[PDB]
Amino acid sequence: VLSAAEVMQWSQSLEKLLANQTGQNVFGSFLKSEFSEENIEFWLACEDYKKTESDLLPCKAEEIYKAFVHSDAAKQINIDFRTRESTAKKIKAPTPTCFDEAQKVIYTLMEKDSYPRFLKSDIYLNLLNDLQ
């Protein structure tokens, strides 16, 4: 089961928070309350894409591009033109690292903006304090 120490270690880094599926859920909830959950949903879609098999990457790449990257995506991630263009070019003949560029920018965006606030929120504090 989930620990207290474990939750405190979530303040060490975003990587430690996203390391486990529990922390993903809790941070996910926070992003939903701030209307920015598409960032984590995208990050998770990239992670699955990496473990996805050589054969099915063309479809998985197109799917993720349409769902998150394209101008008109319903869950359009906040990335600049140069990053969106270079992702666009990679969708045609996609390799496993296809979305690394965009993934890094959405991690940095979550890490620098959303995450410092998460650590000061009711969701996190109520979780932490109720386990002690």
Binding site: E34, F35, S36, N78, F81, L109
Partner: protein, 310 residues
Amino acid sequence: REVKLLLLGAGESGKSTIVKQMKIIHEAGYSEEECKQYKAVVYSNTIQSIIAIIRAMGRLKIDFGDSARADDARQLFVLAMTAELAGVIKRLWKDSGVQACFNRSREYQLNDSAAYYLNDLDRIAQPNYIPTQQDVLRTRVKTTGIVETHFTFKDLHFKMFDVGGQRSERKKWIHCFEGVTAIIFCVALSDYDLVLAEDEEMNRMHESMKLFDSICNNKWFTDTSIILFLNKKDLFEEKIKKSPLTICYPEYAGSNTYEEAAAYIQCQFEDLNKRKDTKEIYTHFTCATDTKNVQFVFDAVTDVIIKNNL
């Protein structure tokens, strides 16, 4: 006696900076411990700023003044605060060619606080460096989503909503749009010769205008006080000397002087109002990083809200 306040505007127009001023003016300042948490941000800003200029140089094919800077630039990329990194940054920043590329920052994407930080590197790079309140105000952190803040002023309880920014964030704005008492719509005056980070083909001020046209005239805001912050007027004052307003407004027939060109921009936005009979735009020229100026302007804005919901 609640006031629902929206901070809206395009990416990098100053919305989060006004939110910071609200914490300073109404919730009493940034402490020493809070300021120290912004050290990493200031460093990250400074570092990503000098890197952006150096990468531009490669793409624009600008030479270094002195070719020994080539090894500094390489070191910058590998390093990226140490005394070594500080010295790398200082030497790059003082180089004739990096400066040349800096003055051409309209051709790529550069933080507006680059100079502020890079010109004070001696102060920032000291081991016992504690960010000043102004250093905090000048920091850059891209906002994604919608963030709600509370504060009380003149016995009014403000529920304030701060939003992103970029085209991608704007679809999410609808979820704030109910029961709005006031909108502070921010525009970056100095964006008149820049291009959208999310679309290299669209002039930033043209975007801001189209966005204001949409918000100002929206039927959800018929009973909402629309306040327009023509912000970054300090950056604008410096820039209009160097870079003609005709890059943004080809028909502009007036002089490249702070006061005429500022007036023209104001009138371009104020003409977008399609209900001039029933509705007034309350316009203020602001400098969001100037606490004194935001305190005076916010006091006026709050009086406009009292008079309009009275």
